[PDB]
Amino acid sequence: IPETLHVEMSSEDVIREGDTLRVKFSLLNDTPLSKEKQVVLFVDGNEYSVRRVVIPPFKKEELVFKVEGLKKGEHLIHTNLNTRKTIYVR
């Protein structure tokens, strides 16, 4: 059987120092088995947060991560599910 989830990551392109970044993730299961997944968020190469998800067949789950404490400059946000983005802190 096919064994892969369909993923999309999204957030704000630019925030102000002191503000919070909201990172949204959609996971779609179009396979015939339920999937258990650890979704890990990395900030500048370092592990920042993790969520356990169970996704039944023919279902979409939505997650939000809140990222605090980002100082002025540009930052890489990435996951263990092959999604990557640059974010700019004004």
CB closer to a copy of itself, 17 vs 47: 47
CA distance to 22, 68, 71, per residue, from 25 (Å): 10, 17, 23
DSSP 80: T
Torsion angle of C-alpha atoms 42, 22, 26, 82, degrees rounded to 10: -20
| 4 touches a copy of itself by CB under 8 A | yes
| 85 touches a copy of itself by CB under 8 A | yes
Interface residues toward a copy of itself, by CB under 8 A: 1-4, 13-14, 38, 40, 45, 47, 49-52, 74-76, 78, 80, 84-86, 88, 90
